[PDB]
Design an enzyme around this catalytic site. Sequence first.
Site, mmCIF file in Angstrom:
data_model
loop_
_atom_site.group_PDB
_atom_site.id
_atom_site.type_symbol
_atom_site.label_atom_id
_atom_site.label_comp_id
_atom_site.label_asym_id
_atom_site.label_seq_id
_atom_site.Cartn_x
_atom_site.Cartn_y
_atom_site.Cartn_z
ATOM 1 N N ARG A 134 -4.164 -1.590 -4.790
ATOM 2 C CA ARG A 134 -3.897 -3.012 -4.609
ATOM 3 C C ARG A 134 -3.997 -3.492 -3.163
ATOM 4 O O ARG A 134 -3.395 -2.917 -2.260
ATOM 5 C CB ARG A 134 -2.521 -3.381 -5.169
ATOM 6 C CG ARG A 134 -1.926 -4.632 -4.536
ATOM 7 C CD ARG A 134 -0.496 -4.880 -4.984
ATOM 8 N NE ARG A 134 -0.392 -5.048 -6.428
ATOM 9 C CZ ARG A 134 0.679 -5.528 -7.050
ATOM 10 N NH1 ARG A 134 1.745 -5.895 -6.354
ATOM 11 N NH2 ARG A 134 0.682 -5.645 -8.368
ATOM 12 N N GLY A 186 -1.982 -0.087 6.507
ATOM 13 C CA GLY A 186 -1.936 -1.025 7.614
ATOM 14 C C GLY A 186 -3.090 -2.006 7.538
ATOM 15 O O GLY A 186 -3.576 -2.313 6.455
ATOM 16 N N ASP A 230 -2.697 3.940 -3.981
ATOM 17 C CA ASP A 230 -2.740 2.862 -4.959
ATOM 18 C C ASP A 230 -4.016 2.049 -4.719
ATOM 19 O O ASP A 230 -4.730 2.279 -3.746
ATOM 20 C CB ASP A 230 -1.485 1.987 -4.872
ATOM 21 C CG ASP A 230 -1.546 0.979 -3.738
ATOM 22 O OD1 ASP A 230 -1.777 1.386 -2.581
ATOM 23 O OD2 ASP A 230 -1.359 -0.224 -4.004
ATOM 24 N N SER A 266 3.563 0.515 2.757
ATOM 25 C CA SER A 266 4.785 -0.209 2.415
ATOM 26 C C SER A 266 5.584 0.491 1.313
ATOM 27 O O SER A 266 6.783 0.285 1.188
ATOM 28 C CB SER A 266 4.467 -1.653 2.019
ATOM 29 O OG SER A 266 3.480 -1.703 1.009
ATOM 30 N N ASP A 311 7.472 -0.780 -4.848
ATOM 31 C CA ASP A 311 7.037 -1.614 -3.737
ATOM 32 C C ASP A 311 6.161 -2.760 -4.228
ATOM 33 O O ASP A 311 5.224 -2.553 -4.993
ATOM 34 C CB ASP A 311 6.295 -0.760 -2.700
ATOM 35 C CG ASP A 311 5.595 -1.590 -1.643
ATOM 36 O OD1 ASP A 311 6.198 -2.552 -1.136
ATOM 37 O OD2 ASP A 311 4.440 -1.270 -1.308
ATOM 38 N N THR A 331 0.820 -1.204 0.000
ATOM 39 C CA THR A 331 0.000 0.000 0.000
ATOM 40 C C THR A 331 0.860 1.263 0.000
ATOM 41 O O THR A 331 1.800 1.388 0.781
ATOM 42 C CB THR A 331 -0.970 0.021 1.209
ATOM 43 O OG1 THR A 331 -2.064 -0.869 0.965
ATOM 44 C CG2 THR A 331 -1.523 1.416 1.464
ATOM 45 N N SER A 374 2.375 -2.604 -3.319
ATOM 46 C CA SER A 374 1.502 -1.668 -4.014
ATOM 47 C C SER A 374 1.385 -2.018 -5.490
ATOM 48 O O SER A 374 2.188 -2.776 -6.020
ATOM 49 C CB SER A 374 2.011 -0.234 -3.853
ATOM 50 O OG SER A 374 2.619 -0.048 -2.593
ATOM 51 N N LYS A 434 -8.777 3.151 -1.266
ATOM 52 C CA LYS A 434 -8.079 3.429 -0.014
ATOM 53 C C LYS A 434 -8.252 4.864 0.484
ATOM 54 O O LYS A 434 -7.718 5.232 1.527
ATOM 55 C CB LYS A 434 -6.597 3.073 -0.141
ATOM 56 C CG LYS A 434 -6.354 1.597 -0.413
ATOM 57 C CD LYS A 434 -4.874 1.269 -0.503
ATOM 58 C CE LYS A 434 -4.630 0.147 -1.500
ATOM 59 N NZ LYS A 434 -3.371 -0.587 -1.220
#
Lengths: 226, 234, 219, 242, 231, 232, 199, 204, 238
Positions: C19, C47, C17, C129, C166, C1, C169, C33
Site C-alpha cells: 500500500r 520512507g 506490504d 510505519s 497500522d 508501510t 500499511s 516495495k
Amino acid sequence: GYSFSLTTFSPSGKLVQIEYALAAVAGGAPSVGIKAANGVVLATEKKQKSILYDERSVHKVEPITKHIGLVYSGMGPDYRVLVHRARKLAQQYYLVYQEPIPTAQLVQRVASVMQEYTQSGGVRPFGVSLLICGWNEGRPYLFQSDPSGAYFAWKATAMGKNYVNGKTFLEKRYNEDLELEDAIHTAILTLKESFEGQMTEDNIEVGICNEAGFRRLTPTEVKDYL
Amino acid sequence: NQYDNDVTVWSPQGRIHQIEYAMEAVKQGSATVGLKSKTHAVLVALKRAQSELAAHQKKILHVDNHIGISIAGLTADARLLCNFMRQECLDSRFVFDRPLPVSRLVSLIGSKTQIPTQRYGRRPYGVGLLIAGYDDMGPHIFQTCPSANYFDCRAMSIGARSQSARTYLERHMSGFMECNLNELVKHGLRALRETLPAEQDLTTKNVSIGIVGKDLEFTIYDDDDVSPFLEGLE
Amino acid sequence: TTIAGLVFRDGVILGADTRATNDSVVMDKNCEKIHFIAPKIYCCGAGVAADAEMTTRMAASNMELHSLSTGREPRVTTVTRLLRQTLFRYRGHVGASLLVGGVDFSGPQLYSVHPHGSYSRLPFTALGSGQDAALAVLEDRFQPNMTLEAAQELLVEAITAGILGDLGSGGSVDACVITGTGAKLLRTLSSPTKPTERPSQYYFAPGTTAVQSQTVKPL
Amino acid sequence: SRRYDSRTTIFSPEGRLYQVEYAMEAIGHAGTCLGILANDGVLLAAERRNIHKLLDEVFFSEKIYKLNEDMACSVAGITSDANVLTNELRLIAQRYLLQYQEPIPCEQLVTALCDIKQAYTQFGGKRPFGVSLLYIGWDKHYGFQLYQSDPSGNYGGWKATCIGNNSAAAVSMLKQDYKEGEMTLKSALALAIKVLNKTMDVSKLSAEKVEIATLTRENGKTVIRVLKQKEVEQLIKNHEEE
Amino acid sequence: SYDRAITVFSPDGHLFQVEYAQEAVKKGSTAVGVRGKDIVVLGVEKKSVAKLQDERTVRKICALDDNVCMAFAGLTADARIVINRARVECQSHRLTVEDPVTVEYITRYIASLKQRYTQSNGRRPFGISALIVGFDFDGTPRLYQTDPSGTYHAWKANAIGRGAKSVREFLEKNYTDEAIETDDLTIKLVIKALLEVVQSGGKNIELAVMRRDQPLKILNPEEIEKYVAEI
Amino acid sequence: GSSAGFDRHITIFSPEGRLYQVEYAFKAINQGGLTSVAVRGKDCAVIVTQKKVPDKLLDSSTVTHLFKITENIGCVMTGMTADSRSQVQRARYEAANWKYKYGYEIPVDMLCKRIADISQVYTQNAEMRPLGCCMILIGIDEEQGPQVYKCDPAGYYCGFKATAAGVKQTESTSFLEKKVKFEQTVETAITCLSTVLSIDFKPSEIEVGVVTVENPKFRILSEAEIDAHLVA
Amino acid sequence: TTIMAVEFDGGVVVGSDSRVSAGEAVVNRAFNKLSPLHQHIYCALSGSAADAQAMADMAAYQLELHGLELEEPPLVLAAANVVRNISYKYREDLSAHLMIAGWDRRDGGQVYGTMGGMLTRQPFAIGGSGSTYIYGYVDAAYKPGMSPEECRSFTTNAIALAMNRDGSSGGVIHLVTITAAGVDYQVILGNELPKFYDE
Amino acid sequence: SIMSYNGGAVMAMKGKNCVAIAADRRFGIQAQMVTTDFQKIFPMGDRLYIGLAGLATDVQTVAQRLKFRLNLYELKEGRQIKPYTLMSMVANLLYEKRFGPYYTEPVIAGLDPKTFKPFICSLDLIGCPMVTDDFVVSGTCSEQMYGMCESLWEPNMDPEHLFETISQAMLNAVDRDAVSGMGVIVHIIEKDKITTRTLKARMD
Amino acid sequence: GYDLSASTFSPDGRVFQVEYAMKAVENSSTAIGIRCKDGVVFGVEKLVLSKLYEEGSNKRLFNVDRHVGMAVAGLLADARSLADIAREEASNFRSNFGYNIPLKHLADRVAMYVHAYTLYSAVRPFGCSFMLGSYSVNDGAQLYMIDPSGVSYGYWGCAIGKARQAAKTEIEKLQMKEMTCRDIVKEVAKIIYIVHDEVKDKAFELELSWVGEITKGRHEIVPKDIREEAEKYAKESL
C-alpha cells in the site's frame, strides 16, 4: 596537459594520427563477428607468448550489459579504458530510461568518446577497433567502431591481423538464413584461416549474444565447438 | 642552442642558461655599493641618465623604516620585487606589531624568486638587489640575485664594472665596524667612484645615498642633500 | 508501510506490504516495495518513496558496474557501505529507510539502513510505519536457524500485523526468499484483504454525457 | 609546450588558414552530396560509400540526418566530426523551440552552427571540423530553402549546389540545367539523377549507391522522407530512357 | 585552456600575425564607402556571381542599427562574428544611455575588439577590415574604417579589399564638393569608383545607401542598371 | 622502424602504429641492473629478488625491492627506483581506498588492473612520460587461492603461474617454462634467479616475500630463513 | 548510551551497553558499540549512530594507511589525534564522542577522551547519556593498580548501574580487553549482569 | 498551498485496448478565474499524452522541457518513445529538482507504439511513478476523483463506455471543487484514432 | 633532442634531464654525513667565493625540524626550497598525528615530492642532493640521502658533492658503528679537510652540525669549542 590538438589535417586532407592508430589495429590479433538470424558471435585469438600467462586471468571478450558484449583488435590497455567507459554509459542510460540501452545507442556513445580523442588537447586516438554485439527488440546487432569514431553496422566482418583475407572468407561463407550454432562454426573457421598453430579452447575466446543475453562461451563449450 | 631558451631546460653541463642570461641583466645595470659598520648600514648608487635633458633614474627605494634597497637590472622587475617586500613588511607590522627581521625578509625573496626558475614558460627576475636594514641583530647588507640566491655580506657591489668597487671594498673592509657615519659613507663613495671612468667623477646628480642605523630611519639623500657627504672626497 | 526481514537457517527472507498512501488516502493498492539490488541481494524500502526508489536504483546500478569489473558476485557488505556512505552524504535529507538482505560468499546477511547513514547488522529487522507491529511478532516468535517454510510463515505474520494494525500499511503481502542456490521473488504471497462483491450497480449509456464539441483524428 | 604545438589557428604569410584549407581537401574526397530546390520542395541526393555486401542496412540513412520537424542535412568529409555537428544542430533547434515555442528558421540554424565552426578556426588550438553540410528546410519566413556550410564556418543559400567528390563538375552541370522558378520536385529529382550519373565514375548509377531525401509541405506540415529503393530504381530507369 | 601567444613582435618591431591578417583583407572583394552631403553610400563587388546562389544570403553590407550599417572585406566568417558583437553592443548602449550610438562610438568598439585580439593568448587577429557609415543624432554623416590591427580613422571616401589602392587613387582625383552635390551624384561616384576594378560592370556590384533619418536601403539590380547607363 | 614528426619524444602513434616512448620505458626497467622472479605454488606464492648493496656505508635494511601493499598483499618492483616507490605508494592508496568504500580487501587482480589503468593514461597523454618500472603482485585470494599478477609501463597486466622481470627476464622465463611444462616453489624461484645469474647467492644477497594459504599475511624471510632454503 | 574505558598495567579494558534508541522505541537491543580502529586500538561510540559510524570508519581508513606507510603498529596517541582532528574539524556538524582505548609498544595501555575535538588522557573514562548516573560510583570505586580482572569487574559494575538507571542504555554489556598478547572479546548477557539495589 | 494556487484536475482511465485522459480547462489565480481554455493535457506521441496539474507556470515549464527531451530522444533513437520510458524520463526530470521541485503531478496515458497496449501512470512532484491498471487522478479535487473512479470504473470497458465513465467521473468530481471546472476536455486514445471532446459543464 | 624534457625517454630508456640535474650537484662543494653509535654528524666544505661575505653566509646546513637536520649540495636556491618543503612536511605530520615525524617517513615524503618534478616538461628536476639526519630514543640514529631522481636510501656514512668518490673511501676506513658524536666530529672535520682541494676551489669554511644523545635529540650546530678542537685536530692531522 597540452591544450592543442595532436591530430591535425595534412595537406592532402588526411589525419595521419588516425591513419597510424589504424595501423596499430591492423597489426592486432584477429577478431571476427557474425550476425546470425537468431544471434551474433564474437570470436578472437588469445594466443599467449608463453604457457606462464594464466590465460583465464584476462578476457578480450567482455560483457557491457546483460545483452551487449565487446571484443577488439589493437591495443589491449586502450581496450580496457573503452570497456569501462561503455559500461558506465550503459549504466547512465539505464538510470534515465529504465530500459537497457539499445546496441546502436551504445555504439554511438562509445564512438563519440573515440572521436573526442581525435580532436581534444594533448592526447592520441585509441589504438583499438571495437566489435559490439547486442540483442534488442528481438533482433541481433553487430557494429564496428574504429579509432576515428566512425561506426558501421555489419552482417559479418573481421579485424586485426589478416582482416582483408578474413573478410573475403566471410563474403563466401556468410548467409542471412544462417543460424547461430552454424555462425559459431564459421566464426571459428575465419580465425583458423590466419591462426599460427593448434587452436585450443584456451587460446581463442568466444562470446555469444541472443534473446537469453550476452555471454562468454566457457572453455569447456569452446572445446565441443572445436 | 637548444638549451638556452627555457628556464626548465637543464643543459648537459648541469647549468641553466636562462638564469645565466638573467644575471647578465644585473651586470649591465649601473653600479651600486652597500657596506655597514657596527651601528649603520648604507647604500650608494650611481644614477644613470638616458640623456642630458633627462632626470637620473631612481636607484634607491624605500621598503620600510628599517629596510632600504638598491637595484640593478630590469627596473620593472625591481619595482615588482619592491612591492612584494613592502607588503611583507606591512604584513609583519600588522600581525606581530614589529618590524620584519631583514634576514627573514631576504629568505622570502629567495623563495619567491626561486619559483619562476623551475616552471615552464616562466622566467627569472632580471634584477639584482642590495638590501640595507637594521633590526635586533644590528645592521645588515644583503645581496639578492636573479637565480634566487642571496648572500649576507659586510660590503657588496653589483652592476657595470662593480668588480673594481669590490676590490676596493675588500681592501678597506677591516676598518668598517669602527667607522662612523660620515666615515663609512666616504668609503662607499670611494668604492663607488672606482667603477667610474677616468674622466667622469661623482657629483650631486648621479649619486644617491640611503642610510639606516641604530637611531635613524632609512632615509634617502638626493642631489643637494648629498653635498655634505661629497664635500671632503680627495 | 511495513517492511521486514529475517535470517533463517539457509538464507534470508524479505517481506513488505503493497500500500502506497498520500497523507491519509490510498494512492496505490499494489506497489512493489521489494527492489532488486543484485541477483542475490534485495532491498525493502520505506520512507520517501521517490528517495527509496532512486537510491536503490542507483545502488543496483553501481553494484552492477562493480560486479562487471571484478567478475564476481557482489557482497552484501559492499551494498550496505555504498548505501550508508551515500545517505550520510545527504545528512538525512534523502528519506530512505532500507532493509538490505542477501546471500554472498560469506553467507546470509541482513542490514537495516537509516536516512542519516547509520546501519545495523541483525538477525531480524523491521521498518516503516507498521514497524512496531512486525517487530512485536518477531520478538515473540523468532528462533535462530529457522527452516525456510517456518521463516516465511513468521515473516508473513509479521507483515500481516502491520497491515492490520497500522493505517499506513495494507493490501497484499510480498515476500522474497534468498538462499545460496536461488532467489524466489514471491510478489503477492498472500492476499488477506479484498473489496466487496458489489450489491448494487450503476452504468451509463452511449449518450449520457452532453458533448459540446468533437474532433476525430484517424491514425 | 611550444615545441609540440601544431599551431592550428594562426594565419600563413598570405593570410590563409591552412588547417581550414586542408580540412577542405578532405571534403573534396568525400562522397558526393547534391541539393536542388524546387517550387514544391527541396531534395538531397548523396552517394553512399558504405557499399561492402556484408554491411547491414539498420538505419534511416548513411549520410542524411533529420534536424527537427522542418529540416534535414547531409554531410561530406569526416564522418565522426559530422556526428558531433549533427548532434549540435539538434540541440540548437531544440533550444530555439524551447525559448520561442516555434521552429528555428533554417538560416538561423545554419548561422548558429557556423559560429561554432568559425570559433575552432580562431582560438583554442584544436583542429577544425572536417565537414561540409547541405541543409534543406521549410520555414514561414522564406519557405523552401537550401544552404551549404564549410569548415571555415562560411555558409551561403543556394538554388542548387553540390559538395564532395566531383562537386566542380556537378556545379557546371547544374548551371546548365537548373531552371530558376520553373523547377518541380519531379524535375529536380530527374536532374539529381542526371548530375549524379555524371559525378559518379561507376557508369551504371545503381539505386544501392545513392540516398535521396525529399522535403515537402502537406496540409501545413513539413514531410521529410527518404526515397525507397524502388522509387530510386524507377528514377534511374527514367534517366536511361532519356 | 589554450594560452599560447599567437601575435608576437618580430626583430624589427613587426607583428607578423597582424600583417598576415591584413593580407587576408587584400584578397577580399573591393568595398567602397563615400560620405556625401546628406547621404552615405556603400558599394561592394560581388566577385564570382553564380546564377544558382541566393543573393540575399551573402550580402557584405549589414546593418548594426537604424543609423549604423557596415561593409567589410576579408574573411566573411570573421566578419559575421564582428558584426554580431557590434549589434549586441548597439543594443547595450541604447539601453544604458537611452540614445542611438554615434558612428564613431561603435567604430571605436569594433576597433577595440580587433586590437584586443592582437594582444591576447590563444587567439589570432580578425582577418577583416570594415567601413562604417551612418548619421549621428545631429544629422552629420559619418564614415569610418577599421582594420585587423585595431586602428581606425574617419574618412570622406575610402576603399578596402582587393584593389583598394587602385580605387583610392581614383577616389582622390574624383572626390570634390561638385561630386557629392546631389544624392544621385554621390551614388554615381561610388559606382564609378567600383567600375575601376570590378570586372564586367553592371550587376557585379552590390550597392546600398543610407539617407538621413530613414533605415538602410538596398538598390535593386534594375535600379543600379539605370545608374550605370547614365555613367 | 619508420618515424615522423615527434613520434619518438611523446606518446603518439608512429607510422607503423607503435608507441616508441612506451618501448623506451621498457628499456628503463633494465637500467637498474636487477631481475625479479615470482612463482605461484599450489597453496603459496613467492617473490625472489636480487639484493645488491655495492656501497658498504649504505644501510642494507633500507635497501629493498619488496613492499607491503596491504596485510595480505605484497609486491616486488623492478626498474627505476624513484618511479617504483611512487607506484608502490599509489597501490597502497588504491588498496586502502578500495576497502574503505567496498568493505572488503581488494583482490590482487583488481589491484593490478587499477595500477595498469593508471599507467595506460601515461601512454595516451603526451605531457607526462610513462614510469620506468614493473610491478609484480602476490596474494592469496579467498576463492581462487594463490595469485601472481604483473603490470608494466604499457598499461598491460596479466595473471601468472610464474613470471620474471628485469635484465634476465627472457632467461628466467625460459627456465620457468620447462618447470611448468611450498618448498619446491621457493626453491624453483631461487633456482631460476641463480641459474640465470650463475652465482648461488647467500642469505644476505636476496630477499624473499611469501603468502601461503595457511598464512595469508604477506611475510619477508630473514637471513636465517633464506639460508635454510639455500642449504637444502 | 553508556561507555567506559579503564587503564591497567599492561593494557586497557573497554566496555559499553548495546541499546540503540529512537525516542522511546528500541531500534536495536544488541548493538556493539565497540569498534576496532586497528589491531590493538579500539573505540567506544556514543552520541549519533550515523556520525559515530562515519567517523570511526574514516579514522580506521586513515590509520590503516598511516600504519602501512610507517611499517609499524600505530600509536594509541596517533589514533586519538586522528579522531580528535575529525571531531574538532566538524564540531558543529557531528554529534558523537569516540572514546579511544588501546595498547602500543611505546606507552602501553592508554585511554583517551576525544569528545568535541578536545583530547585528554585519563586513567579511566566514561561517556554517553548514562555516564552521568555513575560519576559518583566510579569516583568512589576506582583504585590505582587495578588488575585486568579487577578492571573488567569495575567496568561491568559501572555499566550495569548505568543501564538500570538510564532509559537510553540497556541490553547486554560488550567487553573488550586489549593487551600486548591481543584482543579478547566478552559479552555479558542480561541474565549474567551484576545485580544491585533495583528496588 | 502552492499546488492549489491555480487549481486544476487531471485523470487517466484504462479501458479494453484504449486509454482515456481528461482535465479541467480553468486557469485562475486563487479565487479569480482568468481564462477557461488553459491547456493541461499535452501530446507526446500519436497515442501518448501527458496530463499536468498544479502550478500553472510549472505545468507549462515541465511540458516544454519534456518536449525538448522527447524531441531529442526521438531524433537520436529513430523511434517513437514507449509509454513506460516516457514515465521514467519524466521521473528523472522531476527528481533532478529534488530539493526545489516543479509543482506539478503528471499523469501519463497512452498505448505502446508497437503493441498498442494500454498504459496509465501518475507521478508525484519529486518524480515517484505509480503504474495502475484501472485509473489515476491528480489535482485539487483528487479525493472527489477517487470516489468517482472507485465506484464507476469497471474492467474491460470499450471506447464508448470508457468515455462515459471518465466523463461522469470528472464532471461530478469538479462540481464539488471550487477551483476546478470551466469545462472538461476528454481524449480517447485508440489503436487507429484519437477522439477529443469538450463536455457540457458548469461554468461557475 | 631526447634530452630536452623530463617527460621524454631516450632510445636507451634514460631520462637525461634528471641526469643533467645530477651534474649540477656533481660540480659543487662536498658535504658529509656519518651515522655513529648515538647520533649523526654533518660536515660541509663551504666554499667562500668572496671575502666580503659574512662569516656564516650561504649556510648549507638547515634545521628542518627540532630533531632533524639537513645537509645539501648543488643549487642553493633549489636546496633552500626543498628545505622549506621538508619543514612543511614535518610540521604537517605533527599537526595530523601529534608527534615528531619519523626520519624515514619524512625522507620518503620529501623524496616523492622531488620525484614529482622528474616526469613532466612543465617543470624541471631539482638541481640538488641533500642528507637527512635525526636522533630519538625510540628510533636511534638515522641518516638518509635524496638525489634529483627522487631515490631515497638509508646510510651509515654518506658523501655528496664534487669530491664524494674520494670522501667515501675516507669514510670507509672508520668504525662509526661503535663511535660516538663526540669522536665522530673530529673525523668528519678531518675527512672534509682531506678531500678539499687546495689550488682549485680555494678558500673554504667548515660547517658542522649534529643530532644525537649528546644534544638530547635536538639537531644543532656543533659548539664553537668542540668545532675548534675538531678543526685543530683536522689540520694537525693532515
